[PDB]
Design a binder for this molecule. Sequence first.
Ligand code: HEM
Ligand code: HEM
Ligand code: HEM
Lengths: 83, 727, 309, 727
Amino acid sequence: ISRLGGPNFHEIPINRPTCPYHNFQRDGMHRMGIDTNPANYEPNSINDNWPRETPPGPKRGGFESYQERVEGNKVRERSPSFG
Amino acid sequence: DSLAPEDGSHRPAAEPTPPGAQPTAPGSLKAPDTRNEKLNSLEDVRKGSENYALTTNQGVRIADDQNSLRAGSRGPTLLEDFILREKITHFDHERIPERIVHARGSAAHGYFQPYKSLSDITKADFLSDPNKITPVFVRFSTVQGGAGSADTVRQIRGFATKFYTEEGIFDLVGNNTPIFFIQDAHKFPDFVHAVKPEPHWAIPQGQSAHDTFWDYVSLQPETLHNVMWAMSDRGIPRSYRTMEGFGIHTFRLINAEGKATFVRFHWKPLAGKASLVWDEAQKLTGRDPDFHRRELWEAIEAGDFPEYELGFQLIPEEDEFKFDFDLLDPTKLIPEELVPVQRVGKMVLNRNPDNFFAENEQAAFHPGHIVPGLDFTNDPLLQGRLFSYTDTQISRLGGPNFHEIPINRPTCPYHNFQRDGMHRMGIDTNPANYEPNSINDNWPRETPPGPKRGGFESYQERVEGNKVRERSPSFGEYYSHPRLFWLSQTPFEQRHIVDGFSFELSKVVRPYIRERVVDQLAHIDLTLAQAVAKNLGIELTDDQLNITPPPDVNGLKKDPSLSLYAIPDGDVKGRVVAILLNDEVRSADLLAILKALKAKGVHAKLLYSRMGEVTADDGTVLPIAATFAGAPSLTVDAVIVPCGNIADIADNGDANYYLMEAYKHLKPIALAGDARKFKATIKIADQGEEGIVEADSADGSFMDELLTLMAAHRVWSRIPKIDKIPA
Amino acid sequence: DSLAPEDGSHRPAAEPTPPGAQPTAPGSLKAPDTRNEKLNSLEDVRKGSENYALTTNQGVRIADDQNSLRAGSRGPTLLEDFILREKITHFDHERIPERIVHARGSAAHGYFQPYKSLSDITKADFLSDPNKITPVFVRFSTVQGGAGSADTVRQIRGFATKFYTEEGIFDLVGNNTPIFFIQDAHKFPDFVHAVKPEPHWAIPQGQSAHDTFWDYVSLQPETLHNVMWAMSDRGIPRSYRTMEGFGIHTFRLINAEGKATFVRFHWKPLAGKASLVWDEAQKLTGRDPDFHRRELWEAIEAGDFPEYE
Amino acid sequence: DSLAPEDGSHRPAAEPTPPGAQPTAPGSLKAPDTRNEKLNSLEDVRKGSENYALTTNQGVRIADDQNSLRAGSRGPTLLEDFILREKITHFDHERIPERIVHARGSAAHGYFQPYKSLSDITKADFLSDPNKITPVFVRFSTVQGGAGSADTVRQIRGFATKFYTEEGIFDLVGNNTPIFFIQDAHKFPDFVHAVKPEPHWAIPQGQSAHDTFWDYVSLQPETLHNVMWAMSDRGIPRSYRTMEGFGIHTFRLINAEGKATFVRFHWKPLAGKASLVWDEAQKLTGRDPDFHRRELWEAIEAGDFPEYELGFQLIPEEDEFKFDFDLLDPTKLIPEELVPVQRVGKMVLNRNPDNFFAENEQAAFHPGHIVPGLDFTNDPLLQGRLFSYTDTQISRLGGPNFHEIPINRPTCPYHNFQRDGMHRMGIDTNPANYEPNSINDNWPRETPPGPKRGGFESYQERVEGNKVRERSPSFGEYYSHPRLFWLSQTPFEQRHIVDGFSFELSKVVRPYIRERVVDQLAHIDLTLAQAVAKNLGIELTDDQLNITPPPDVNGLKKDPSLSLYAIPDGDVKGRVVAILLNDEVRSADLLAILKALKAKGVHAKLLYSRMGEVTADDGTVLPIAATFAGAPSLTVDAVIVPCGNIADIADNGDANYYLMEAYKHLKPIALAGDARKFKATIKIADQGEEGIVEADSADGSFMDELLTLMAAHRVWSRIPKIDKIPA
Ligand code: HEM
Ligand code: HEM
Ligand code: HEM
């Protein structure tokens, strides 16, 4: 944010994805993309809810985190296995 | 040059004075003797002006500040004019980004003190002793509009308090309603984008009456509870002094023994709860868009300090699951009938800032700023807030050293190994900038947790479950809290809720959105849904008419603490009355009127058809504060018309409209002697009516009766009568 | 889920419609056939939305945009939720400083063309040929109020036009009265500080009815001329379409022969001159603070295009 | 805790100590009693550390600064860890843009005092009385490289002084050569882009030996004069203490009567002029890239304060057109033979900063920062600088309030109507933020120009001419100053210039550029041109051999003041000698050596093949400062090898190389007793050579010889002999 002057550093040419990118984020310093979507929020009915979420799947699916088991108290402690 | 008037009337007296009596001024000049630790610590950066030479920022005296340097008096300006370039350069760079939300806000300095030690439930130092005074800086705000938007819009209001404690800054960043619109911080950008001005054309500015807000609401029923509060008169407070404040989330208190207690924070207005009515609020955004900012500043200059009582709803760790709702769900409130608010302390706001930009615009509040004795919970809206405020202040305030901007500085010691960054003020002399180090004997050093002056340690809450992006099933109930709110309101408050929804949905251009919102209202209460539908020309279906209402909340079918007016809490001090003058006022009426108002701390504004002075019947010269159009009835709480030459203003359109507007907006009106001729303007019967005070003179019980009406705020029984009235 | 109405009433028709007949919309969706060289050149950065997957800014498809990642459904949010952090970070950094003056403004795209060649008085390319069109972008504004202030305040109005010519951008940055308040730019910070909200309390927002403004005026008689225009009904225009525009300064026109001619620039409203009355204007800042912005947008959506000579 | 050593050897003594005797430290800790008005005014922002608890920036004490908060000790990190986030956020935002040019610099605090009142020629308050002491902050720098580039590169050096006067800040922003490369500021971006790292690959970093620089030079003959200075040993100073400083431009002094006198500013090093030799300087960029920064810091810590005399070349207004060059042309110098430098005062740098980033990195100097008594001229390079420095500081230092960053603040009063901007520290209490005003009686007020404490008024110079983008024809002469410079150098200085051009042009890949540069040199001097040409394998043409040399400058065929060494001015105080030890040193030699050095203020570094200590013949334990490879001969001014067990080091490759390197770089070498066995390694005849001190023991005669050689800096007569040394 400070090094590259704002939240649109992904629009600087070298950083841009070569695949499609569409979402409801808007504005910010040096905004290049000019959004035509009637909606800047979801859920919406005014743009029939696009762009839309995509379920996880074998190919071209949405990102879902691996459901790792978490168990313990909230601590600021180094694991004894690291000592 | 020496341009001030020789009589010294350019300068306000440094003593408490009523609204409009003197020009307002910087806090330190208006009340130099009002001090606190924080105010005193700002003396290193306060800059005076009187008797100093005008200079550049480098200290060079300026000889001619009226002209640029040019080659000949009609020639081109030269690049070597460094005085011109510095002055214009600073001007060109004055603005900084406004806050992403709550950009419109008004602030003041004050102090807090606990009533008794709370050491048994929290080790927080600022709550440990009744004689410990903690300076505070409070900012009140709206949510949607920009910094230049209007004050009396229909919106949730922010209520943020920075406590400068001896163990660190604690920021309590709350709103004026006990719940928020959404459950998870991940939807904050969606909700905010839906309420803010629509992206193609940037309309509308500070009001939620537009398609995208109601589209979102219709598709996300979790929002209905806070929407109900915004559509009530809670969304249009009379003043920041007359609204409640809430932290919303369940936090934790931690005592020296390590026991955690759940807590919800409350602020109770000692001036009482009071709101405007919609037509008055909307018209007031045009007649005076700075009404709440002005009213706060002038209350403080008058000595009518905004006072609030801090209160806690406390729930033992073992009672976490004993309610019908989840304690961690921010769309749910905790009814006071189930868990009472325990009084904790008092906060008094008693000095305005010196410079709005330096102190108000640059202030940075963050709910993550807690101190030992407090802790967070897993409320998923709170959890996301902890990330957002730190992040947004990097760009808003130009870097990571925003804690060095004077208003944000702690009053207690701060030492660490953090260095550099834009605008670095502190010059560190420590040989080390890391720890552990031996080169400075490891200072500054970590401090173990303890009962007092100890290091921060998080409460060891057990965490158990898989990593998931999932809403707890316990949060999936959206209509019982909205219904509990609805049933707790008086009949006139219910009508105002109906009118709020009706007006807002009438500005929604896509009719299907209006229909979907009506369908959601049918899940809350059938009477509410039918009354809004009627106003929209929509008919409920037979299915909608048979939706079974949501269950009561833990057996409650109403809680009177959710109403603004069900339980009277009126306070007349600080209120203002318009007095409509004529060119030969009966001085006796005026003497009686003004002294009765003064005795109760009620202000007055003497109005006429022009400025200047008018002479009473006995020769008393009366100074005029404003004209009828210049200070409309929207800005006052009641209207009094004294006797005298009533023929002077009897046919004045503005004077008659003043009473019609005040009458329509349910304000008490008092008419003395021949001023009773104005009864025909508002259609009052010969025998009179409740809400209209009238007598042969302003003597006897005339003022006591008017003040009784003022204590009740508005004349709710007049609602049916105002229905007609062309005003 | 949450979807469009079956009947298609969520979307505005892409044809000229009168004010209030349809929901307003982005220009390229409302009038896709209206083009000019500048409007076409913006096609590289225009971004659609229909039929596309929701993603992060790095192009990763999102599966659940309703929830943060937590350890258990009632658990603490995790630092590894990069989807949440990117979305909130962008939101957190949406705002940029507003303009120091003229922060409240409304704009539109259009085109200009000269009636005949002016090569005898100027070699400027955009004025050389009656059939050579130049794309413009115009912004109208007030002076004092912030970006979120009201439109129908009593103030001078700005009228700025960016001409995208074949020989460079020419910006004609004018106001709606033929003179300015002050004579030398060195006093601009003083005049602007005097008209803006007073420094102690930041009141009042978009109106000059306050002590500091009138103190400056009373001490600087050079301001009286533009003050007269501001106090007249010129200070409260009915619409941006019904006010005049002026460059104010004397500039020069230079022809191919090197001859200079002094010039003052004017815009004449082809809809005529019309203003509100004070009581109406002040009440309208409350009933609809976005009145001029709305009126301009709806006039263009109706085919009532603002035209100026 | 207690990580510091129990003997207290982690902290440096707060008393002057020689280079390497103690660990260096923040200025206020090393010399707490060295004070001046500016240093004292910085006390409000100085932050200590000893005995304080470690906190967040909000003042909350930290218990564990070793770990993040996580769910289980091997679990995920939680978003609610606000201590971790604050610390990482600050770290993430530490860096600010470096300076566009002169990014690599080293700075110190000091003071200035005049030698007499200059009120007859200027009303500048800081020059009005010999007892007026003005605090100063000085930054020395290279031009091209980034902030992390090396010190001993071949480049022009910057010499910027901030004077904190009673009438405002005056910044004298100069360089170490009397002219600049270009004439008009419009070409600065072109020249700078040409000298900086080439745009495709960002190579090379801090040296001008690349195609684009020499392309620009070859196409812009105005650059040749400053190029001549850079290619001479002036481009590789031994220390910031041993170089001259110049303001370059002709400015004006204005007295109380209003008379203007043209002035050129000069800084004369009281330690004398001294430079490195190219091989030594280039190798020193690898062995110690911080050599000049270290040397400045350690000289101040040792009490070897950098001292400079301020000097003025003064030319009456009526003598504007009496030279054969234009006084406003910054590529032209004013020969001291024609206009002598009047010695006006002395500046002493006697305290290092506490924090490099806060004080050095954030310092902002601007040549437009002048005070009453001084004024500009129409020099076209100076005119454009006036715009540039103000503009670049807005982004480099984050806004328009960079004058509030502690090091930049004036020590005198500053009051004006400027308000707001990012990171606004000052809280203005003036009711007015504009003038004229009546509400504050027009304060702060303008002040008419006058003899003392008056407002700034520009000298009313007559301007007559048309608006044109045109170079004055008077600036169109490029070869006579370069020629004057060349002819003023000693023979060995001339050789070094030839070698400078030859090495740099050898690194230019496009051969035609080298040829075009040689053609330009043929317009300056044939001998120079031929000698460079020969090293490049180029043959001058018939035509180039006949180019008529440029005219002398106002009758001068040389000026000895342009030479570094023509006129003896050496000073050994502060210089350093390497002493090569062996395992059984003749302690009588060391005593005599060290006693004699100490009497002249010359430091010593005791070197060996390992760290630790050795024991002398008599039992004296000698502590080793560094190894032969650890502190190469590049870092010292002379080398001394005492007697003892030479067999220990006679076969040490590093020991032999140490003497070969020092010999190659023309440094004085002294060999006592059996240390004369090292004469074979540097091939010195049995009868000895001038520059090599040898004797049976290290007595007083031996030491006086060596210190006499040190006073002459280097052994220039050895040049013809270093060709045959493989080093
Ligand atoms: C219980 C729900 C919330 C309450 C009561 C609340 C309250 C407030 C208040 C009173 C302010 C203004 C402080 C001031 O006067 O400067 C504010 C500002 C802000 N809020 Fe919250 N807020 C809530 C939820 C959120 C959430 C969920 C987020 C994002 C995840 C968020 C992000 C922000 C930001 C970025 C600002 C601007 C802060 C600054 O610029 O200094 N808020 N909020
Ligand atoms: C004849 C007198 C002037 C006129 C007609 C005028 C007109 C305007 C207009 C119409 C705008 C808004 C352009 C937009 O829509 O973005 C503007 C902005 C501005 N004006 Fe001027 N102005 C005048 C005098 C001045 C002076 C004397 C100064 C300072 C020396 C000044 C400084 C500015 C600045 C700094 C902005 C903000 C521009 C930005 O942020 O892009 N104006 N002016
Ligand atoms: C006689 C010719 C010049 C001299 C002696 C000179 C000297 C210097 C010095 C010594 C510095 C570094 C100050 C410090 O230590 O922070 C500097 C920085 C700088 N110079 Fe100049 N310079 C000259 C010409 C120019 C010109 C012609 C321009 C542009 C028109 C320019 C633009 C700059 C800028 C932008 C900086 C950085 C300032 C900052 O970031 O604070 N210089 N110059």
